[PDB]
Amino acid sequence: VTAITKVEREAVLVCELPSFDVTDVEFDLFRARESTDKPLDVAAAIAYRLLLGSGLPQKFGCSDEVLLNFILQCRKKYRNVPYHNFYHVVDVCQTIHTFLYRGNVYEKLTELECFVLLITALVHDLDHMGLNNSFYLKTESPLGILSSASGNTSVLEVHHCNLAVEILSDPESDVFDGLEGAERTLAFRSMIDCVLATDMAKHGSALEAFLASAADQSSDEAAFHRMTMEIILKAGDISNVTKPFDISRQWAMAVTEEFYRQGDMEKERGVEVLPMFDRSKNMELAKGQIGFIDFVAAPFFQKIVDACLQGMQWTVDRIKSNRAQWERVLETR
Ligand SMILES: COc1ccc(C2=NN(C3CCCCCC3)C(=O)C2(C)C)cc1OCCCCOc1ccc(-c2nnn[nH]2)cc1
Ligand SMILES: [Mg+2]
Ligand SMILES: [Zn+2]
């Protein structure tokens, strides 16, 4: 429940981000982290600039100070893990900004829905420990038992939602405190629906529902809006392969190390270790990126672009050039 101090706020406000354009599709968060000995302050400043530059917080009665308090309460609940840390959720926030404003998806949503999506990026992985839903269920960890007894197998996504509600229950960090009645309800419900939809076990069914709503000129409007928000948070979450090859590769190194640490702990517990979680298989980075592109990311981006989101064509183009580059790594090995 512990309030953000003036000194914590000042450490973010001093960062000027010289030579960076946080609105650009080629923005490099790894270069921003290396540019300073306070990468946590720079990351918080990127999020702050993105939210104020949208012009949205101003319109919904969220002060500069409440916005920065929210950003810093989110930052305190991320852990020192290789991939699911504060840098991932700031990356997802920046990426969604590009999808809304460079890919023109803002045209499909209200200003409130655009504001909720940028805020939801920063809560969507709160208190991730670098272990996936499967780890908690296979090991019968206490959180796994609660999820099973409770009837919801989205172990981590329900936990993230719980900590988001906690942050927003204090007016000093409630970016939605300017709303009342149906607008306040829509902000909380849409945020929660979006976080729950990031569970990759629901990937196929969430994509098929969005594609069927987009094809139907008589789809319920409220339902189309909600599904568009869910698909944009999902797109940000699997956007690593849509970036400049070097940025893409650094993300792939970070996620591989997190997977390998999970596999190490599964060996110690004596439970099943999948091949891509096992250090001993020594599986090549190139073959793993090509597989992720072919079976997950290329069909996802191509289908949503063709169905509805024409302005995001650059994502399909960049996945194509990244696949070709991984093929040159194999051809020359
Ligand atoms: C920068 O890179 C990556 C970024 C994110 C991921 C993820 N991955 N996951 C998945 C975990 C388990 C796999 C299932 C999906 C979800 C996440 O939750 C997340 C964390 C989204 C992964 C990144 O690197 C990828 C490494 C090899 C993956 O390789 C493959 C191959 C083949 C098929 C495949 N074949 N047939 N059907 N699927 C899938 C994946
Ligand atoms: Mg997640
Ligand atoms: Zn995520």
UniProtKB/TrEMBL annotation:
Active-site residues from the entry: H84 (proton donor)
Residues bound to Mg(2+) 2: D125, E157
Protein residues bound to AMP: H84, N85, F86, Y87, H88, D125, D237, Q289
Annotated binding of Zn(2+) 2, by residue: D125
Coiled coil regions in record: none
Domain of life of the native organism: Eukaryota
Domain PDEase intervals: 5-333
UniProt-annotated binding residues for Zn(2+): H88, H124, D125, D237
Annotated residues for binding of Zn(2+) 1: H88, H124, D125, D237
Amino acids binding Mg(2+) 1: D125
Family of this protein: Belongs to the cyclic nucleotide phosphodiesterase family.
Protein's name according to its UniProt entry: Phosphodiesterase
UniProt organism field: Trypanosoma brucei
Organism classification: Eukaryota, Discoba, Euglenozoa, Kinetoplastea, Metakinetoplastina
Gene: PDEB1
Residue range from the parent sequence: 586 to 918 of 930
